């Protein structure tokens, strides 16, 4: 019951408003902001993911890492009724969290939560009825953007126009990812990088749009 995790899940509980993403978001931000574990996320990584999936409007997004929930529930609180966010984890304990937070918004329906590995859960996309992602939201686990990018185009579920947006991209961390993608006739590439009032950016990301082959 001490977890940071758990921490943030209690604070929305005692604070926040049951059903409503924006008390949910609001709640997650303003503490972890007063605990200075992370400063002002809705403006530093918020803002950029909403413009992200309100400029395409996707029907299938794919998280890949989740901790408390916050991007889980800032992504399913923008999908349209015929859309749906699959979010995988393998720990159990931030899956848990995450199912929670989304269950306090009110946005379990939008969110089906696969506990895992990546290199186990990717390849059997197939079995969910999953031919190609429309987004694919890189979150937490820097060191293993590469290695699931590459996976997810070796099982073909990247289309021309797929956004990838990688958070926690801030120089000289991942430069293997970024190395990749920039470097890669596959991918057109965004850097975002939200300074706050600060010198110093708080939180880096990049946006990475396929281009490539559809099948491997």
């Known amino acids: 019951?001490?977890?940071?995790?758990?921490?943030?899940?209690?604070?929305?509980?005692?604070?926040?408003?049951?059903?409503?993403?924006?008390?949910?978001?609001?709640?997650?931000?303003?503490?972890?902001t007063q605990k200075e574990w992370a400063m002002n996320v809705g403006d530093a990584k918020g803002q950029i993911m909403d413009e992200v999936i309100q400029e395409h409007n996707?029907?299938?997004?794919?998280?890949?890492?989740?901790?408390?929930?916050?991007?889980?529930?800032?992504?399913?609180?923008?999908?349209?009724?015929?859309?749906?966010?699959?979010?995988?984890?393998?720990?159990?304990?931030?899956?848990?969290?995450?199912?929670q937070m989304l269950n306090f918004a009110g946005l379990q329906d939008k969110v089906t939560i696969l506990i895992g590995?990546?290199?186990?859960?990717?390849?059997?996309?197939?079995?969910?009825?999953?031919?190609?992602?429309?987004?694919?939201?890189?979150?937490?686990?820097?060191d293993r953007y590469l290695p699931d990018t590459i996976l997810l185009e070796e099982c073909g579920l990247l289309r021309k126009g797929t956004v990838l947006l990688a958070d926690n991209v801030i120089v000289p961390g991942t430069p293997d990812f970024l190395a990749y993608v920039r470097g890669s006739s596959s991918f057109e590439c965004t850097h975002y990088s939200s300074y706050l009032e600060y010198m110093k950016v708080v939180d880096g990301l990049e946006k990475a749009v396929y281009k490539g082959p559809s099948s491997p």
């Open 117 to 142: 590995a990546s290199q186990d859960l990717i390849p059997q996309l197939k079995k969910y009825d999953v031919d190609t992602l429309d987004m694919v939201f890189l979150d937490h686990w820097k």
């Open 1 to 32: 019951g001490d977890t940071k995790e758990q921490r943030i899940l209690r604070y929305v509980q005692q604070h926040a408003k049951p059903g409503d993403p924006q008390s949910v978001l609001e709640a997650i931000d303003t503490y972890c």
């Open 58 to 99: 996707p029907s299938l997004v794919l998280e890949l890492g989740a901790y408390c929930g916050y991007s889980a529930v800032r992504m399913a609180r923008l999908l349209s009724p015929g859309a749906r966010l699959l979010t995988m984890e393998k720990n159990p304990d931030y899956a848990a969290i995450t199912q």
